[PDB]
């Protein structure tokens, strides 16, 4: 099968979002925190995935692997 | 000293950008490619770093560690 395994690194699963439209799938993450004394107060990422040219629109399957990977497939 | 070591993962050093203004430092990366048959055609990340409250504005030092880490310090 056709599969994309995305390493989301330190982003928690509740911080991820999957958005699909017209043969494209965009996975993103968003994390914020306090750090009153400084540090990384927010971070985010975005990955644009182009699906195979034969799949229907809004036709995607996503899930979390046991290792914590975001699995994107047709 | 005060130091932030940022793991940029698979982003090439030429794809990174450091932007600082008014006690904040934002490091980001941007990567794009072809993948005519599908796959990840583009990806990016953004990290907002709050500097210590005593540093002057636009006062920052950045460099690449031997392991490829982006080192942000006052």
Curated annotation (Swiss-Prot), chains A, B:
UniProt entry tagged with the keyword Phosphoprotein: yes
Record keywords, A-Z: Chaperone, Charcot-Marie-Tooth disease, Cytoplasm, Disease variant, Methylation, Myofibrillar myopathy, Neurodegeneration, Neuropathy, Nucleus, Phosphoprotein, Stress response
Residue numbers of the full-length protein present here: 95 to 168 of 196
Gene that encodes it: HSPB8
Gene Ontology CC: one annotated term: nucleus
Family note: Belongs to the small heat shock protein (HSP20) family.
General function of this protein: Involved in the chaperone-assisted selective autophagy (CASA), a crucial process for protein quality control, particularly in mechanical strained cells and tissues such as muscle. Displays temperature-dependent chaperone activity.
Organ and tissue specificity: Predominantly expressed in skeletal muscle and heart.
Places the protein is found: Cytoplasm; Nucleus
The protein, known as: Heat shock protein beta-8
Predominant location category: cytoplasm
GO function terms (MF aspect): identical protein binding; protein homodimerization activity
Subunit and partners: Monomer. Forms a ternary complex with BAG3 and HSPA1A. Component of the chaperone-assisted selective autophagy (CASA) complex consisting of BAG3, HSPA8/HSC70, HSPB8 and STUB1/CHIP. Interacts with HSPB1. Interacts with DNAJB6. Interacts with BAG3.
Inducing stimuli: By 17-beta-estradiol.
Disease: Neuronopathy, distal hereditary motor, autosomal dominant 2: A form of distal hereditary motor neuronopathy, a heterogeneous group of neuromuscular disorders caused by selective degeneration of motor neurons in the anterior horn of the spinal cord, without sensory deficit in the posterior horn. The overall clinical picture consists of a classical distal muscular atrophy syndrome in the legs without clinical sensory loss. The disease starts with weakness and wasting of distal muscles of the anterior tibial and peroneal compartments of the legs.
One GO biological process term: cellular response to unfolded protein
Location of the sHSP domain: 1-74
Coiled-coil blocks: none
Domain of life: Eukaryota
């Amino acid at each position: 099968p056709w599969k994309v395994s995305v390493n989301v690194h330190s982003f928690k699963p509740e911080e991820l979002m999957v958005k699909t439209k017209d043969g494209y799938v965009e996975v993103s993450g968003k994390h914020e925190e306090k750090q009153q004394e400084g540090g990384i107060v927010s971070k985010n990422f975005t990955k644009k995935i182009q699906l195979p040219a034969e799949v229907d629109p809004v036709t995607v399957t996503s899930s979390l692997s046991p290792e914590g990977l975001l699995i994107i497939e047709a």
